[PDB]
Short mmCIF file of C-alpha atoms in Angstrom, two decimals:
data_model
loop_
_atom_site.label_atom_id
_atom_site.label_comp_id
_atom_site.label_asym_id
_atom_site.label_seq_id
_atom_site.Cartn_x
_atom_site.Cartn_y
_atom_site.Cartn_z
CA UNK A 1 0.00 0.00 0.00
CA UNK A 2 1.92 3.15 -1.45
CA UNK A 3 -0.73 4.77 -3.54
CA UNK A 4 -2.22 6.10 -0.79
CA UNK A 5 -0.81 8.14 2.06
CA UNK A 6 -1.17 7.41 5.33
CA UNK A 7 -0.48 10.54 7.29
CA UNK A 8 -3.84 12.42 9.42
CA UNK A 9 -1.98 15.98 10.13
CA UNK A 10 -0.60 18.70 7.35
CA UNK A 11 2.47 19.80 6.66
CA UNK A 12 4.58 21.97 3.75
CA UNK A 13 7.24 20.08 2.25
CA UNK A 14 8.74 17.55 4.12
CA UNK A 15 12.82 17.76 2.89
CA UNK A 16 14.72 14.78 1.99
CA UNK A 17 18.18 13.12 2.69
CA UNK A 18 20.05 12.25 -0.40
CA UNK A 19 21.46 8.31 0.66
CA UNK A 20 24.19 7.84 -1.69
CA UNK A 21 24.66 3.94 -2.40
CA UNK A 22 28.93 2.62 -2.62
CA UNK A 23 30.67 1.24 -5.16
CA UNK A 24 29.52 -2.16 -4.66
CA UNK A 25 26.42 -3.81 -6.69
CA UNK A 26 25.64 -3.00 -9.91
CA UNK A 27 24.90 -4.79 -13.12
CA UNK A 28 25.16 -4.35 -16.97
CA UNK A 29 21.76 -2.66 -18.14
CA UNK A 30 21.41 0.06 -15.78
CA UNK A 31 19.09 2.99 -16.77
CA UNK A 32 18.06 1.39 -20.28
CA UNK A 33 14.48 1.87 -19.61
CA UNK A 34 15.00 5.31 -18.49
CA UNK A 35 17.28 6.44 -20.84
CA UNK A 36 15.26 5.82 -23.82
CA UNK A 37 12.25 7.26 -22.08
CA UNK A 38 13.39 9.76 -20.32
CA UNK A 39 14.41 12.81 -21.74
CA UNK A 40 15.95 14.59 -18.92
CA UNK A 41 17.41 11.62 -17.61
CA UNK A 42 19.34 11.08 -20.67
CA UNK A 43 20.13 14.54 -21.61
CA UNK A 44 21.95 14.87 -17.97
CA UNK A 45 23.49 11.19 -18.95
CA UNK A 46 24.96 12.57 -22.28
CA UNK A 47 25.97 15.64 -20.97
CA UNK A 48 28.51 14.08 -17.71
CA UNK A 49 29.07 10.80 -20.39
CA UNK A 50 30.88 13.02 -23.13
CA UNK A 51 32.30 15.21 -19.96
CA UNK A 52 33.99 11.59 -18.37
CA UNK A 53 34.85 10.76 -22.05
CA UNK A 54 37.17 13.97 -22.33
CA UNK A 55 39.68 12.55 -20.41
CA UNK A 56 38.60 8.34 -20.11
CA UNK A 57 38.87 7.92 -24.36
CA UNK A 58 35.57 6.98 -24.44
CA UNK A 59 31.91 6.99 -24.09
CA UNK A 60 31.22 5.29 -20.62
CA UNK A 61 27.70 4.31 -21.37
CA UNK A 62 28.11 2.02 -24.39
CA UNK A 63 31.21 0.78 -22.63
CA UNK A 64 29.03 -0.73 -20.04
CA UNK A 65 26.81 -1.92 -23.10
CA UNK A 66 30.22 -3.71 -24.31
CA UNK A 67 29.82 -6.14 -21.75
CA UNK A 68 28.98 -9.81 -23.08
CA UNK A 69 27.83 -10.61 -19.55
CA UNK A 70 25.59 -9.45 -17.01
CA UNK A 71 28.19 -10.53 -13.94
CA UNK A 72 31.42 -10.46 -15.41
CA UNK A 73 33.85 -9.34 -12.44
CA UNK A 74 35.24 -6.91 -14.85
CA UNK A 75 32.50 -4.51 -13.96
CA UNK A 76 33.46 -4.73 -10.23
CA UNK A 77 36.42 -3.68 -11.59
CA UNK A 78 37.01 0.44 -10.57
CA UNK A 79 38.26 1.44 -13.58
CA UNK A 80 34.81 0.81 -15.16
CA UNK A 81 32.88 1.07 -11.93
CA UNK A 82 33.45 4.46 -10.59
CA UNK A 83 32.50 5.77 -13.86
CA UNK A 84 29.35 3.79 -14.22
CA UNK A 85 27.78 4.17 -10.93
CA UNK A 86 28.72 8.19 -11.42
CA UNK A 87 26.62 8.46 -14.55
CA UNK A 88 23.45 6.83 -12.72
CA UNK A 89 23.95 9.28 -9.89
CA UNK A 90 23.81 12.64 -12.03
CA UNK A 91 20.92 10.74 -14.49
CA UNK A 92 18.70 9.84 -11.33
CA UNK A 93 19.65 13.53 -9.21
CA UNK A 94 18.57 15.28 -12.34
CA UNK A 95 15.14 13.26 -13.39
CA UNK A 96 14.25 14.10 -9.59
CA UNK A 97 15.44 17.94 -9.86
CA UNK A 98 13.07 17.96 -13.25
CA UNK A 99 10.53 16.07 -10.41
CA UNK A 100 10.91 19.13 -8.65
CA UNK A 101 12.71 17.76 -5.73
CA UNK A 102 16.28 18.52 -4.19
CA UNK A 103 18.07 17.19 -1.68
CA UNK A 104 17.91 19.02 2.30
CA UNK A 105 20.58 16.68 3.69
CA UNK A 106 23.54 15.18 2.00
CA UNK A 107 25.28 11.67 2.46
CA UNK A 108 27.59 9.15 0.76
CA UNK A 109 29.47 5.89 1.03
CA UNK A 110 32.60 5.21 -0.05
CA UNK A 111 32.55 6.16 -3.55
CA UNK A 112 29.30 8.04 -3.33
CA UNK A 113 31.02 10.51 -1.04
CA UNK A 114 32.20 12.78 -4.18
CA UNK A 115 29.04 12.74 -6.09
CA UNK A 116 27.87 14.08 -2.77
CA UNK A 117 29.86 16.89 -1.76
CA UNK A 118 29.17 17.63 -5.78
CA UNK A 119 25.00 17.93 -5.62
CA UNK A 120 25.37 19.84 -2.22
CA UNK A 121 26.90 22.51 -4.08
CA UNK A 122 30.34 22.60 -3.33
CA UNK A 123 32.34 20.85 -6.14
CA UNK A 124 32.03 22.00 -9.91
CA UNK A 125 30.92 19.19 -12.79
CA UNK A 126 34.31 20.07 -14.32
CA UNK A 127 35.96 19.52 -10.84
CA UNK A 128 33.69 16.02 -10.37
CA UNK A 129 34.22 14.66 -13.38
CA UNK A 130 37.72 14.80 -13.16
CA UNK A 131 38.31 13.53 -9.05
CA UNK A 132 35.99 10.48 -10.73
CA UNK A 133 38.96 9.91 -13.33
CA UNK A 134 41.46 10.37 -11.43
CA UNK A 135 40.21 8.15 -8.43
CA UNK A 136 39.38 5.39 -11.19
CA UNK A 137 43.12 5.16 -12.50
CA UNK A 138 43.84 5.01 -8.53
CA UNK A 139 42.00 2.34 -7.51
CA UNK A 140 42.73 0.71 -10.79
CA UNK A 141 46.26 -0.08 -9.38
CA UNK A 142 44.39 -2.00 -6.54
CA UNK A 143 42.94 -4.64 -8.22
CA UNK A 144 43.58 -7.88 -7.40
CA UNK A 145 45.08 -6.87 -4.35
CA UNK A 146 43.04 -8.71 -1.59
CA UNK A 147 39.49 -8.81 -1.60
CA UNK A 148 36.28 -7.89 0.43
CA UNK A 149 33.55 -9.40 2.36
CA UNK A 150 30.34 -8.67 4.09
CA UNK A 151 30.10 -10.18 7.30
CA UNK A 152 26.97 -11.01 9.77
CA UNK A 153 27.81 -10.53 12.86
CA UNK A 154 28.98 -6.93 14.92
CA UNK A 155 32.07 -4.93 15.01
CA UNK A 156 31.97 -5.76 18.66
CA UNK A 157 32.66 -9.06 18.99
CA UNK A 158 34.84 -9.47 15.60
CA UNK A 159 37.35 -7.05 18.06
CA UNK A 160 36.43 -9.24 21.16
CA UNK A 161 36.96 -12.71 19.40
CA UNK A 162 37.99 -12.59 15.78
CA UNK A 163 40.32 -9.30 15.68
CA UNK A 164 43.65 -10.74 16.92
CA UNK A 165 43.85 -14.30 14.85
CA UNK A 166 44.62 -12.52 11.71
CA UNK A 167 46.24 -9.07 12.08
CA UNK A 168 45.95 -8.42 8.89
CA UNK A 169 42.82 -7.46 7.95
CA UNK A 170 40.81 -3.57 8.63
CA UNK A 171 37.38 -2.71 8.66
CA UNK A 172 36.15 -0.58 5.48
CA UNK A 173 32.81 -0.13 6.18
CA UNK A 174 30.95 0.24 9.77
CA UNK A 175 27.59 -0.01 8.56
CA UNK A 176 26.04 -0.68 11.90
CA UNK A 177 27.58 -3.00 14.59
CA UNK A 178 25.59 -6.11 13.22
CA UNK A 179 27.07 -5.85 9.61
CA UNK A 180 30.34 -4.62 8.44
CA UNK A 181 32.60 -4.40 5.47
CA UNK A 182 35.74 -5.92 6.06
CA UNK A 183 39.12 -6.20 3.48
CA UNK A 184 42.52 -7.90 3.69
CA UNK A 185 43.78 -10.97 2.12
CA UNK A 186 41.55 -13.47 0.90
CA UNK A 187 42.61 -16.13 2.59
CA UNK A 188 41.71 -14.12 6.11
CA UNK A 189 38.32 -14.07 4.94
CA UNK A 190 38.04 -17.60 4.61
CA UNK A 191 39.28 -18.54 8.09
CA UNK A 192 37.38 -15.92 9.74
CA UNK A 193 33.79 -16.72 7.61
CA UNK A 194 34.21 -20.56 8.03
CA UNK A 195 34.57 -20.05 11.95
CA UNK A 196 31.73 -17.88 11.83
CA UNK A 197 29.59 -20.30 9.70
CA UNK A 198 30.94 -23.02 12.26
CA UNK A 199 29.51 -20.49 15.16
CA UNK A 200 26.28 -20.67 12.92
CA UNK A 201 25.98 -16.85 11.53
CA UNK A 202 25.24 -16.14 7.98
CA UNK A 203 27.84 -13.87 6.01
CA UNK A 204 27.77 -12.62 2.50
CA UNK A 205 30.77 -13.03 0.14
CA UNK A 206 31.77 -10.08 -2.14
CA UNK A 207 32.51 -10.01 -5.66
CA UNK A 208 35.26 -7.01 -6.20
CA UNK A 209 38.84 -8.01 -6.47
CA UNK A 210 39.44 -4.63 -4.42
CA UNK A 211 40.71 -3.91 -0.94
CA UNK A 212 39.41 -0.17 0.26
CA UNK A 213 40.44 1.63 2.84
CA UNK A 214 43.41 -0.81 3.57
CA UNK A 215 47.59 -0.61 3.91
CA UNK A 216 47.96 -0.90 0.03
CA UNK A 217 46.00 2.40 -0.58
CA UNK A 218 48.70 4.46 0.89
CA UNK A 219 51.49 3.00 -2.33
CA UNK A 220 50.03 5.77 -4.95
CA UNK A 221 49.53 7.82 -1.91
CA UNK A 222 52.27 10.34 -4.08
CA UNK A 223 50.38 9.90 -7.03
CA UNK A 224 46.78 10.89 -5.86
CA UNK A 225 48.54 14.36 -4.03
CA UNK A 226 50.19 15.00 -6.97
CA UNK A 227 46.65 14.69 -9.42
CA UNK A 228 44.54 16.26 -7.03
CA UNK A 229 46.60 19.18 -6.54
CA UNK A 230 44.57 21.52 -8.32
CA UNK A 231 41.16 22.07 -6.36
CA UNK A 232 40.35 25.63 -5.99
CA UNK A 233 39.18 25.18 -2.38
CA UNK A 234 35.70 23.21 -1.65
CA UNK A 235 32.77 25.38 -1.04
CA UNK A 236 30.74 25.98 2.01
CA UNK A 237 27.50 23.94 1.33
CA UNK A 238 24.67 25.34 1.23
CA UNK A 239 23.05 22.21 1.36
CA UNK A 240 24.27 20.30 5.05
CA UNK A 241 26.80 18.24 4.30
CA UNK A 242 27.60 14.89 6.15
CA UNK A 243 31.07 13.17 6.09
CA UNK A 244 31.32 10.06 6.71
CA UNK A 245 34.91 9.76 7.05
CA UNK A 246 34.61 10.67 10.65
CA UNK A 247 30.45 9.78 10.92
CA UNK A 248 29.97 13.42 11.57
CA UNK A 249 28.90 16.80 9.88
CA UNK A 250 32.02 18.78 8.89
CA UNK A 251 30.96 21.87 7.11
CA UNK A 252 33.63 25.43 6.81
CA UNK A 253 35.76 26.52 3.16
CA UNK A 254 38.29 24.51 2.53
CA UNK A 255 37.55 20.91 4.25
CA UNK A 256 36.92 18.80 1.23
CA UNK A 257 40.82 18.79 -0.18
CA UNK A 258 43.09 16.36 -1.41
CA UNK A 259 43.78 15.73 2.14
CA UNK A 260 40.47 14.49 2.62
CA UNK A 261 40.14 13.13 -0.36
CA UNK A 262 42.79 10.62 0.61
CA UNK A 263 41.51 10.18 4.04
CA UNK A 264 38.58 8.97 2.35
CA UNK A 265 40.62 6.21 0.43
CA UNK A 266 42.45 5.52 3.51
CA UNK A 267 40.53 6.10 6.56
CA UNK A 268 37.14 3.76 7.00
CA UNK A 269 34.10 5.03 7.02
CA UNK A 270 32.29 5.47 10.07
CA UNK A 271 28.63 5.31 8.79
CA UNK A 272 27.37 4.67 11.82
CA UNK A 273 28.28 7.63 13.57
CA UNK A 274 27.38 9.80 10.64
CA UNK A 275 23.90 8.47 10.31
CA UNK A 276 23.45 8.30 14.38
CA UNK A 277 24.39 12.65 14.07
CA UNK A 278 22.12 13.01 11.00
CA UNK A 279 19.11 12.04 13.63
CA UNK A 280 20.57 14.17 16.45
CA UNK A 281 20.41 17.05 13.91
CA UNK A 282 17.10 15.83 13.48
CA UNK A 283 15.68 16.13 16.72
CA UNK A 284 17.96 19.12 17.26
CA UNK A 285 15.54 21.43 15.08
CA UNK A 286 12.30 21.50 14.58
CA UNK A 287 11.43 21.90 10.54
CA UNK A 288 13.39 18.20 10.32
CA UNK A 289 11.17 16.41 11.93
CA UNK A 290 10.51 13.66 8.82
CA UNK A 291 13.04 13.14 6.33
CA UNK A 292 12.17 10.00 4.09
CA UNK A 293 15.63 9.08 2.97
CA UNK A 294 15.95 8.90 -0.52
CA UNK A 295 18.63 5.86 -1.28
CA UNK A 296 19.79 7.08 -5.24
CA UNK A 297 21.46 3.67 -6.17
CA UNK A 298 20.80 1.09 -8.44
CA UNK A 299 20.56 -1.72 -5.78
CA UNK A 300 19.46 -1.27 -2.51
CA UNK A 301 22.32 -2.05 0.17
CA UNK A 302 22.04 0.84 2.36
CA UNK A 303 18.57 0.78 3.50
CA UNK A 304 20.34 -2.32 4.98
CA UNK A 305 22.26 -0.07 7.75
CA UNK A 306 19.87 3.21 8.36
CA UNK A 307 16.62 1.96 10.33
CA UNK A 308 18.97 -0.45 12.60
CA UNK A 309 20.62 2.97 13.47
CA UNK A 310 18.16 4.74 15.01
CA UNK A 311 19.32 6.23 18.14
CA UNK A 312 18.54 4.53 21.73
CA UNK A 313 17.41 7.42 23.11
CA UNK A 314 14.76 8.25 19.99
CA UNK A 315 11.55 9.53 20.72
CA UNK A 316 10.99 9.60 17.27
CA UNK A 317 8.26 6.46 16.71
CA UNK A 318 8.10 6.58 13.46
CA UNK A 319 10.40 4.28 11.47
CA UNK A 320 12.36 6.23 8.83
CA UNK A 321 11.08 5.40 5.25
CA UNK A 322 13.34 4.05 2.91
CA UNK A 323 12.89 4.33 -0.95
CA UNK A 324 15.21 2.89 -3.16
CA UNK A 325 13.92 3.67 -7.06
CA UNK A 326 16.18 0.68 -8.69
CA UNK A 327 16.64 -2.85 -7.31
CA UNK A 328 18.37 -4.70 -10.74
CA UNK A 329 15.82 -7.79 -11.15
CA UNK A 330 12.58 -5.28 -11.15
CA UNK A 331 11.09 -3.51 -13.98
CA UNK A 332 12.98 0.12 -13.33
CA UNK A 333 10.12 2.16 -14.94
CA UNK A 334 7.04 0.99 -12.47
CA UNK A 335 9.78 1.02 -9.73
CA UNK A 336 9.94 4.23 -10.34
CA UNK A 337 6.93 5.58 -10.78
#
C-alpha cells in the first residue's frame, strides 16, 4: 500500500536526505528503460558521459553496453565502476530535480562521497568529473590486491573474538555494529567466515577483487597528491553536508581537499556515527522532523544499515522510510513511478 498516504496531520514540504549507495552492486543494463524514455534523464546522462569521455577515451555508457555478460567481475572492476555508478547518480539527481525535488541533507558511502559533496553545491561538474577519473586510474592499481567481504555478525565481537587471529585485515565499512565491510587478504576471509559459519551466523561473500580503505592504498599515496593538486578550495555547502569519514557533519571553506580526499581512500568510514548525528540534527531542530531518505542507487544495500541505526534514546516512533527507485531484477520504470 503506497498509492495512498497514510499521514492524518498537514504539513509543507517535508525535505529529503540524499542516501548515496557505494561502489559495490551494480549490473550491466542500468538505466536502459530510463534512458530511452526519459528525456531529462538522458540529456543529464549525455551531458557528464561526453564530460567523463574527455579525459577516459571513451563513451562510458556504451562501454558498459560492451559487456557480453551481465556478472562479469570486470564490472566490479574500478576502472569501469566508478565511472558507471557516477553516470546513474547525475541521471537519477537530475530526473528528480526535473521532479521538482532537491536534496535538504547530504550523504555518501565510499565512492558516493564525491558525487555528494558535488549535488550539495560545493564541487564544480568540471571539478567532479575529473576527481571520478582520477580516483578510477587510482583504484585501478588495486585490483587484485586482496578482496572484500560482508560479514553477519557486529564490530563488537569481531574485536572481542575474531580481531587478533589474523592481524591483517581492517574494517572498510561500519555499517552498523551487526554488519560490516571488512578487506585484507583473501585467505583471512576464509578462516574468519568458516569459523563464523561453524559459530552458525550467515555472512555474504563479495565479488570485487578490491581492498578499500586498507595498507595498500597508501602506495600511490604520491600519485593521488600529486593529481589532485589543483582544487580551488571546496565550497561551504549550502546544502548540510555529512562526512562520513569521521560519521559526523564537517561543514567550513576549505575541508573537502586532497587531504580528505585521501583520508577517504584511507581512513574507513564510520557510517554509523554519521547516520546516528544526522538524527541528532534531526531532533535538534524542529522543521526536520521527517526526512524519508531517498537511497539514489541502483541496488538497494544501504537501507540495509539506516533503520537499525536509530538512536537509543529516539523519541521519534516513526520508522524512517526508505525508498530505493532501482533494485536490478525489477522492472525500473514501475519502480519508479
Amino acid at each position: 500500500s503506497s498509492l495512498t498516504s497514510t499521514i492524518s496531520a498537514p504539513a509543507s514540504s517535508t525535505p529529503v536526505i540524499y542516501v548515496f549507495t557505494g561502489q559495490g552492486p551494480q549490473w550491466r543494463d542500468m538505466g536502459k528503460a530510463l534512458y530511452e524514455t526519459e528525456s531529462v534523464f538522458k540529456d543529464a546522462i549525455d551531458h557528464c558521459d561526453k564530460l567523463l569521455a574527455n579525459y577516459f577515451g571513451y563513451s562510458i555508457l556504451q562501454k558498459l553496453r560492451s559487456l557480453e555478460s551481465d556478472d562479469s567481475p570486470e564490472i566490479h572492476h574500478p576502472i569501469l565502476a566508478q565511472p558507471s555508478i557516477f553516470l546513474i547518480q547525475v541521471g537519477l539527481v537530475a530526473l528528480y530535480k526535473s521532479f521538482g525535488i532537491s536534496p535538504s541533507i547530504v550523504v555518501g558511502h565510499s565512492f558516493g562521497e564525491v558525487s555528494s559533496a558535488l549535488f550539495s553545491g560545493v564541487i564544480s561538474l568540471e571539478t567532479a568529473v575529473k576527481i571520478v577519473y582520477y580516483r578510477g586510474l587510482a583504484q585501478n592499481l588495486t585490483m587484485g590486491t586482496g578482496r572484500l567481504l560482508s560479514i553477519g555478525i557486529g564490530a563488537d565481537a569481531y574485536l572481542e573474538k575474531c580481531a587478533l587471529l589474523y592481524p591483517e585485515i581492517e574494517i572498510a565499512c561500519y555499517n552498523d555494529p551487526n554488519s560490516i565491510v571488512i578487506t585484507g587478504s583473501e585467505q583471512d576471509l576464509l578462516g574468519a567466515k568458516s569459523t563464523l559459519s561453524a559459530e552458525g551466523v550467515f555472512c555474504a561473500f563479495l565479488g570485487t577483487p578490491c581492498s578499500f580503505h586498507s595498507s595498500k592504498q597508501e602506495m600511490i599515496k604520491e600519485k593521488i597528491f600529486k593529481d589532485l593538486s589543483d582544487l580551488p578550495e571546496s565550497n561551504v555547502p549550502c546544502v548540510p553536508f555529512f562526512s562520513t569519514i569521521t560519521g559526523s557533519q564537517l561543514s567550513h571553506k576549505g575541508f573537502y581537499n586532497v587531504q580528505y580526499i585521501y583520508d577517504n581512500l584511507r581512513m574507513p568510514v564510520e557510517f554509523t556515527k554519521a547516520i546516528s548525528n544526522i538524527f541528532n540534527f534531526i531532533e535538534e531542530n524542529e522543521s526536520y522532523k521527517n526526512a524519508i531518505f531517498l537511497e539514489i542507487g541502483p541496488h538497494p544495500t544501504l537501507g540495509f544499515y539506516i533503520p537499525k541505526c536509530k538512536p537509543s534514546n529516539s523519541t521519534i516512533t516513526s520508522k524512517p522510510i526508505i525508498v530505493s527507485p532501482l533494485h536490478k531484477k525489477k522492472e525500473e520504470l514501475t519502480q519508479f513511478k
